[PDB]
Curated annotation (Swiss-Prot):
The lineage of its organism: Eukaryota, Metazoa, Chordata, Craniata, Vertebrata. Ca(2+) 5 binds at D33, D93, D95, D101. Homotetramer. Heterodimer; heterodimerizes with SYT2 in presence of calcium. Interacts with SCAMP5. Interacts with STON2. Forms a complex with SV2B, syntaxin 1 and SNAP25. Interacts with SV2A, SV2B and SV2C. Interacts with RIMS1. Interacts with PRRT2. Interacts with DNAJC5 in a phosphorylation-dependent manner. Interacts (via N-terminus) with RAB3A. Interacts with SYT12. Interacts with calmodulin. Interacts with DNM1 (via C-terminal proline-rich domain (PRD)); this interaction facilitates vesicle fission during clathrin-mediated endocytosis (CME). It is found in: Cytoplasmic vesicle, Secretory vesicle membrane; Cytoplasmic vesicle, Secretory vesicle, Synaptic vesicle membrane; Cytoplasmic vesicle, Secretory vesicle, Chromaffin granule membrane; Cytoplasm. It comes from the Eukaryota. Keywords: Calcium, Cytoplasm, Cytoplasmic vesicle, Differentiation, Disease variant, Glycoprotein, Lipoprotein, Membrane, Metal-binding, Palmitate, Phosphoprotein, Repeat, Synapse, Transmembrane, Transmembrane helix. This is Synaptotagmin-1. It is linked to Baker-Gordon syndrome: An autosomal dominant neurodevelopmental disorder characterized by infantile hypotonia, congenital ophthalmic abnormalities, involuntary and hyperkinetic movements, stereotypic behavior, poor or absent speech, EEG abnormalities, and global developmental delay varying in severity from moderate to profound. Behavioral characteristics include sleep disturbance and episodic agitation. It comes from Homo sapiens (Human). One of its GO terms (molecular function) is molecular condensate scaffold activity. Expressed in melanocytes. GO terms for biological process: calcium-dependent activation of synaptic vesicle fusion; cell differentiation; cellular response to calcium ion; chemical synaptic transmission; detection of calcium ion; fast, calcium ion-dependent exocytosis of neurotransmitter; membraneless organelle assembly; neurotransmitter secretion.
């Protein structure tokens, strides 16, 4: 519970023909530090045909429970290819300004779950409305088999 949860806005840019995932805020960095707080930090990777193509990262303020910053992840590709991609959100933590892992992770795109795919090929399939949606993120144990050619 509360191990993975991010509210990202799925939208497309029909003016230039490119993706633009606007991550508003997240709610998964629960207080794991004894009498303290966690240090949220995430990055995004897209697996084109099961192969890591483009790699990007975001900036989040440490010592918080809700990773908020509002950043946009752009990826230029045809509107017909946006429905056959696979983007995976990689969440991490900097335990006491050091190093930590085993946080939430999720894959969104072509062969994703209904909750994600039904909004993916819905809002960023053609419109440009920044509709943020939340979803439970699973540990990196599941992502290990997803980044290894899942399509
Ligand atoms: O939690 P953040 O606000 O995203 O900041 C972290 C943090 O830097 P700070 O010590 O200034 O808080 C990391 O430091 P460590 O917890 O690992 O000691 C640092 O990692 P490095 O020191 O290895 O650079 C990382 O930088 P990076 O994302 O390049 O790994 C950086 O994130 P930001 O650079 O986005 O602020």
């Amino acid at each position: 519970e509360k191990l993975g949860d991010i509210c990202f806005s799925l939208r497309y840019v029909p003016t230039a023909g490119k993706l633009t995932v606007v991550i508003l805020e997240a709610k998964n960095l629960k207080k794991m530090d004894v009498g303290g707080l966690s240090d949220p930090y995430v990055k995004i990777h897209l697996m084109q045909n099961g192969k890591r193509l483009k790699k990007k990262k975001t900036t989040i303020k440490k010592n918080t429970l809700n990773p908020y910053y509002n950043e946009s992840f752009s990826f230029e590709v045809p509107f017909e290819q946006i429905q056959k991609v696979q983007v995976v959100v990689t969440v991490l933590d900097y335990d006491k300004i050091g190093k930590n892992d085993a946080i939430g992770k999720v894959f969104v795109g072509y062969n994703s779950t209904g909750a994600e795919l039904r909004h993916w090929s819905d809002m960023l399939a053609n419109p440009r409305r920044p509709i943020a949606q939340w979803h439970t993120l699973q540990v990196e144990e599941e992502v290990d088999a997803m980044l290894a050619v899942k399509k």
